[PDB]
């Protein structure tokens, strides 16, 4: 049977969920309990964390524009996601998505992680670029598994202290 229901109009679905594609929620998973994690991410949202995903991520920027701060080959880089752009991110490429536009919408597709395949979330020093803090997580549920992790980093000057230059990371926003 059609466990995930029948086909449905995507632009209409996005419009109808527009109130959830803005702060404080910012995103919405389309189907529940599926192998493919299909999410629409709106805006505005900025962030300071870099994700280390052990699997690929697919992006299709449907509405508005966004960009990904990356680390590529030891250097800091930016991949722009202009409206209409698609992108496939390889495993383990550190990325920090920035979505400054209200009313933007990006289709993001990931896969469920098998037991033992962990995700990393990392912060880097604005002053010297050294890794400041990394947490590895078995990522089941995104909604419960991630906010406390981010909160506890922002709450602690110890966690936020660069081990190489002692500069304390701004936490939630530079």
Ligand X SMILES: N/C(C(=O)O)=C(\C=C\C=O)C(=O)O
Annotated binding-site positions: 47, 51, 57, 95, 99, 110, 125, 128, 162, 165
Closest approach, Cβ 96 to Fe ion, in A, equals 17
Distance CA(161)–CA(125), nearest Å, equals: 8
- Which residues are known binding-site members for substrate? 57, 99, 110
Residues within the interface to ligand X (CB under 6 A): 39, 41, 51, 53, 57, 95, 97, 106, 108, 110
- Helices marked H in the chain — which ranges? 10-16, 142-145, 147-155
Distance CA(109)–CA(105), nearest Å, equals: 13
Closest approach, Cβ 93 to Fe ion, in A, equals 22
| Structure letter (DSSP) for residue 32 | S
| Structure letter (DSSP) for residue 46 | -
Alpha-carbon dihedral angle through residues 139, 144, 150, 151, given to the nearest 10 degrees: -160
Closest approach, Cβ 129 to ligand X, in A, equals 20
**Which of ligand X, Fe ion, none interacts with 167 (beta carbon under 5 to 8 A by kind)?**
Fe ion
Non-local (6+) Cβ contacts of 134 within 8 A are 52, 120, 121, 122, 123
Please give the biggest Cα pair distance in the chain: 58
**Which of Fe ion, ligand X, none interacts with 65 (beta carbon under 5 to 8 A by kind)?**
none
Interface with Fe ion in residues 114-173 (CB under 5 A): 125, 127-128, 130, 162, 164-165, 167
Closest approach, Cβ 123 to Fe ion, in A, equals 11
Q: Specify whether the CB–CB gap between 30 and 82 falls below 8 A.
A: no
**Which of Fe ion, ligand X, none interacts with 57 (beta carbon under 5 to 8 A by kind)?**
ligand X
**Which of Fe ion, ligand X, none interacts with 143 (beta carbon under 5 to 8 A by kind)?**
none
Residues that bind Fe ion (CB under 5 A): 125, 127-128, 130, 162, 164-165, 167
């Amino acid at each position: 049977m059609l466990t995930y229901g029948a086909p449905f109009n995507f632009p209409r679905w996005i419009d109808e969920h527009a109130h959830l594609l803005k702060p404080p929620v910012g995103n919405r998973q389309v189907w529940q309990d599926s192998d493919f994690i299909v999410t629409v991410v709106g805006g505005p949202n900025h962030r300071t964390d870099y994700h280390d995903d052990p699997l690929e991520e697919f992006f299709y920027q449907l509405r508005g524009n966004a960009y990904l701060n990356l680390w590529v080959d030891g250097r800091r880089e930016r991949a722009d996601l202009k409206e209409g752009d698609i992108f496939l991110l390889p495993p383990h490429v550190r990325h920090s998505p920035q979505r400054p536009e209200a009313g933007s919408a990006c289709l993001v597709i990931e896969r469920q992680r098998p037991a033992g395949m962990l995700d990393g979330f990392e912060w880097y020093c604005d002053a010297c670029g050294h890794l400041v803090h990394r947490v590895e997580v078995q990522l089941k549920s995104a909604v419960t598994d991630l906010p406390p992790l981010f909160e506890s980093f922002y709450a602690s000057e110890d966690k936020r202290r660069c081990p190489h230059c002692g500069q304390v990371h701004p936490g939630r926003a530079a």
